[PDB]
Amino acid sequence: ALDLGSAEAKAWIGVENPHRADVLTELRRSTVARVCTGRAGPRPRTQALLRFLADHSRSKDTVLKEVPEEWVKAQGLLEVRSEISDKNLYLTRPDMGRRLCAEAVEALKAQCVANPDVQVVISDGLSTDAITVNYEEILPPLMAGLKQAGLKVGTPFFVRYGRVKIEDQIGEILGAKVVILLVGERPGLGQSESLSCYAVYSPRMATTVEADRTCISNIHQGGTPPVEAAAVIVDLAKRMLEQKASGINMTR
């Protein structure tokens, strides 16, 4: 009796007659990659295939799941959205996910502080878990960072159905010097809570290219811890303001 989602299933060594089985356990411990599952001929072992299939079924669900409107409100966050109306359209229309809807633009000028030095934006993007699991761990220290020995912090808000390029429009509208997006990257097979930060100096819809952005990826408890990542993003923001540059245009 084995639950394919259990720690025991995840730790299963499948190699048949191991040359050195203690090495195998040490190898299995050293990575989250699905090593040491062995084979049947050149094909995967059955248990390995079954767990792969189980993880995929759960992975598919994480792409479709949406954070309650109530949760966004409970974090004290302004919720705005892109031109996208639902999850299905989000997946097929990136061009609409890169643009605020008409009411979103007006809400930003109404409710957010004008001309900030550093603007923090949060969006579900392609993974809701990346936002929900990590939020309380990254957001407070980040805000407290940009304030403590810091400067004119913008007011944080949630964008539903957002794509990275939307931060350019957000930058122009609010007149922000630095725009920080915390967004869900596409779900992995066995992980869904991987968060990335896309940050850009003084963006412009008409001229800003992707290389102008600095990316911090793989933020989570299995990568770079949200707390530790927050201090990185603060220091990144300071550097952007000092150099008046982001992405490939930064030094070192």
């Binding site: 190898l27 995929h56 229309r93």
Partner: protein
């Protein structure tokens, strides 16, 4: 030229070459998203016929982005052998398809003929090929290159070891390397996408890859797939240089999105020549994939197949050791499902081989696309029959850090043993001496990374 045909009594009119090229494509979500797709199957076939009736000259003289406007167009046009072009310029695309497919057309015939093509013409041929056409045509167009291994020899099949980690942890990277090598993966390259784009980290990751390479005297090459500028800096500072990598895009605007100047790729070759631990003459590594130009808003009304072909035209200029499309790396917005991902993989590979580059494929999909692992296994085998130079290998295909599913180490061994294909001969010798492979087949003791300990 004609931009018009009559089909079942009804006239089908097109505005320009660009439109014909686009609407001739098999249906995909990216073409619909770009707004350039056919309205129906009828209009698609009409486009195919119009295209088939256009000459090489018609398509050559009408690149989707104009010469004076685009440095990729310029690079592609300027690389044309005008003598080879003059021979074929009045051929119809229908005739070019049949020429490529003919059993009386040799590898050497195509070697000269392809030099008279441009990427748009290469795309045009692909667009009027069936799936079997793409497979058979590609197979009779081998492209062979040499680093520390030889890749692309008919009867061989290579694989990139992709030992990625969420923190670039060297023990995790090493563990995956040992696992991959035990399945006979890594003759293409041992190549890591790093988390941090930084000289200390790049060196450390390279140090780890080459620690294994040097310990066991492995005929292969290492690579770290950070931006080309940081690889160059790392190598200049004394890090081991194997292959130098850059993702590319088929327009000037697309390259700007990626932060790439052509001068950087010139520099990459010069740095390789000065520093890199490579026996053969090829040392560059490019990756490509349909949808990238569209994402960058840099397709200029052109379909994603034509744009991908232009990647290969650009890549050909730098005579790389390896190129692969990353076929379903992005999402369903560009390729929605199994059918579309398979078709694109076959197209991409065929076009690469027609362009004369060392073309492989990352047979892959994402978890928000309408796809699963059986798709990867379908496509990997089809492309293998097509003479695909290489695929990826990860443990069970699960990328713990790039968040998608590629092919397993298992799958390379499966392909090889199914189709009686061998690794790169240099790598094969090493596998044999390690006791991992005998007569192309995994030994009993293979598939066990503890063998190295």
């Amino acid at each position: 030229m004609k931009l018009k045909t009559t089909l079942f009594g009804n006239v089908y009119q097109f505005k320009d070459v660009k439109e014909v090229l686009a609407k001739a494509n098999e249906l995909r979500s990216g073409d619909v998203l770009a707004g350039v797709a056919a309205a129906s199957s009828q209009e698609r076939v009409a486009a195919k016929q119009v295209l088939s009736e256009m000459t090489v000259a018609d398509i050559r003289n009408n690149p989707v982005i104009a010469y004076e406007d685009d440095c990729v167009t310029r690079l592609i046009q300027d690389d044309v052998n005008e003598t080879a072009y003059n021979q074929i310029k009045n051929w119809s695309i229908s005739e070019l398809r049949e020429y490529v497919l003919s059993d009386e057309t040799s590898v050497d015939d195509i070697a000269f003929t392809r030099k008279g093509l441009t990427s748009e013409v290469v795309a045009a041929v692909a667009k009027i090929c069936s799936n079997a056409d793409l497979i058979y045509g590609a197979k009779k167009m081998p492209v062979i290159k040499k680093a520390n291994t030889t890749i692309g020899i008919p009867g061989t099949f290579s694989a990139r070891l992709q030992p990625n980690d969420t923190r670039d942890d060297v023990q995790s990277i090493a563990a995956q390397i040992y696992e991959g090598l035990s399945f006979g993966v890594g003759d293409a390259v041992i190549g890591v996408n790093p988390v941090t784009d930084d000289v200390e980290n790049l060196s450390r990751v390279l140090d780890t890859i080459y620690g294994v390479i040097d310990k066991f005297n492995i005929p292969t090459q290492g690579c770290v797939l950070a931006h080309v500028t940081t690889q160059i800096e790392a190598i200049r500072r004394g890090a081991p240089g194997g292959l130098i990598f850059q993702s590319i895009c088929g327009s000037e605007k697309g390259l700007k999105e990626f932060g790439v100047e052509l001068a950087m790729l010139d520099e990459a070759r010069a740095v390789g020549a000065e520093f890199n631990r490579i026996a053969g003459e090829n040392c560059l590594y490019f990756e490509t994939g349909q949808g990238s130009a569209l994402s960058a808003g840099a397709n200029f009304g052109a379909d994603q197949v034509t744009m991908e072909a232009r990647n290969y035209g650009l890549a050909r200029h730098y005579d790389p050791f390896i190129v692969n499309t990353v076929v379903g790396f992005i999402g369903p917005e560009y390729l929605y499902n199994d059918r579309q991902i398979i078709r694109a993989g076959l197209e991409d590979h065929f076009m690469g081989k027609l362009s004369g580059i060392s073309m492989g494929c990352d047979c892959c999909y994402t978890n928000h696309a309408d796809a699963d692992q059986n798709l990867n296994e379908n496509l990997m085998i089809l492309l293998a029959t097509a003479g695909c130079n290489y695929i990826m290998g990860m443990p069970l295909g699960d990328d713990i850090m790039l968040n998608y599913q590629t092919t397993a180490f298992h799958d390379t061994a499966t392909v090889r043993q199914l189709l009686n294909l061998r690794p790169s001969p240099e790598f094969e010798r090493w596998l044999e001496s390690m006791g991992i492979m005998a007569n192309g087949r995994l030994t009993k003791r293979a598939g066990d990374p503890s063998l190295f300990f």
